[PDB]
Amino acid sequence: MASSLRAAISKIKRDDVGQQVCPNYVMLRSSVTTKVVRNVVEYQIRTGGFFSCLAMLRPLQYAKRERLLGQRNLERISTRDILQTRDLHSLCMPTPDAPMSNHQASTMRELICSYFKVDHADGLKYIPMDERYSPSSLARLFTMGMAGLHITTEPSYKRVPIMHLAADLDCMTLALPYMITLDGDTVVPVAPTLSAEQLLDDGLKGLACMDISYGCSMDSSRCINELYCEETAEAICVLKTCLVLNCMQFKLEMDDLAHNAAELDKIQMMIPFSERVFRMASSFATIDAQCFRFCVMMKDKNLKIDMRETTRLWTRSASDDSVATSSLSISLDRGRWVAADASDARLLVFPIRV
């Protein structure tokens, strides 16, 4: 009565919260439940990883529940038999089996070392010599650090100074990042011309022209840039950097999903998924040029697109001449960002919760 195939199947993980799409990723990690009402099937998509990554714009809230978890969980996670990308993300480690980045890796390592007052050998555990890192793991590292917790290289939590900006923002419940320019004594929203990564170039200088409007569509609005002083400067740069890093991870994973046929075939032209991807990309449409051009294109096709054509658009949106911008003029009111072409609304980006 014993058989080999049954033994193979026995080992397979049968949690089955839903149809697991793009696991082994950080932000594109997705679950598809099926919900039937009458005779119509509504696919319900749960992408918690992305939404947790975006909640880092409020560091004390990101950290809130985990700071009351002892040094036990980190030590459990590391001792585990097989470490998935989620496990390594919790430890702020390089995530093999997931896309990674080699961009400004030394400046990023130098930042770990300066912020956390740590050695280069320790820096090399976060960002190895292959120079390849996972940007979201690195954001988690810094986001927690602003909240007063350093994830150490031995799985441990060490107490580090809590950033005043994190406490100053913790009241806020909505946020909108955008790009600005200074045309002399006045500040105006501008469309993203550079890519999120290129903000990291030149020692993170281009970050000065990103702003984030925090508020409670929104009210009691406070911009991060008006809270700039000598003491909050570092905290503002890190916050903006973590945002950029999460954007980079998104882009990396999307670029990889364009070529990962296994998971793309698994998505049976779910329009629900392609409008999810539109939400996710809209988060960064105000700070990354590619995601801008991508979101304008999909909204031009009324978001009734299957994932194949969708991640075809992603591939094309990496090039400046894929859509015409110069034409578009952008304004910001009531906490949402609008790009319009001669009174035609080409993209509307709403603020993100937490």
Place this chain on the structure above:
Amino acid sequence: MASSLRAAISKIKRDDVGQQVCPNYVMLRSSVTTKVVRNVVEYQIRTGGFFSCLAMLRPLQYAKRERLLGQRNLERISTRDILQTRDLHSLCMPTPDAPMSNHQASTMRELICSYFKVDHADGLKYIPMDERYSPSSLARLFTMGMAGLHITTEPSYKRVPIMHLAADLDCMTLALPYMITLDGDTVVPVAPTLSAEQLLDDGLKGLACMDISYGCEMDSSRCINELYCEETAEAICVLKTCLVLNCMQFKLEMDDLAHNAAELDKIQMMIPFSERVFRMASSFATIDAQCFRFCVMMKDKNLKIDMRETTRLWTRSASDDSVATSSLSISLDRGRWVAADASDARLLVFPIRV
């Protein structure tokens, strides 16, 4: 034609929100507003000072709006021609026109100095050479200091380090303070034998036998003493000291309300003001012996008592032999402090908000 009476009456600021009761006080500052439905008039008592100063148990929440306000408001308060007690409390100054103490004032100033790393002479401004200080102004100073803000001697907000305990506790919506004893490897709640003031003795080491159970909903309970380590020790000592300071201020003002017949005649009639005084004293009934006894008494008289008799019971409650507390067994269940004589529940103390 003109009148000097008219001119005098003209100069009187008329906020007239209600009948103001015990102004020039910190915690007993009250306002009665008359609400009528049918032919029944019900008196509503607002006592926001008391509940504000107990909200200090969660320091970041106490600081939440005030950290967004600039140094503008503190200068503005100091400029005011008539410095009322309310304004002085905002500035963490000593409060004439209101009661004060001298208990361990030397160790308090040394604490101010230690925590805020400030010289003896400006610490003399907070606690003068008179040796008299307002305990609640001092609790505010320290409470804001855990939140990362120092109210300086010149009106000014100076950024100091934010305590990790303040961040740890900020998810908690309820708190129950109580006293404990260590019998072997089991902690048990005990009745308050000492005075609040007497916990400031023995180099504040007596505070270790106090615990505060924080929770939500209670449900997600944590005891502050569970969170003790050498990094959290300072914060735990200050948080406990600030509670003792607010207790002491409460006591100082009650004693004063005993001899202040000028206010007590005005509120001699209202049973709702007895309910409020019971609610207040119940907050410290677990950590102060007088407040314990006082609260046991009024529960015996079923809370239907006038304020004259009320504050006479207060004056009596100062004496150990006034009620027979030795037969009462103390239990802490459902987030709820119970003092009972066999099957008779002589006092129930409930968790405090924030």
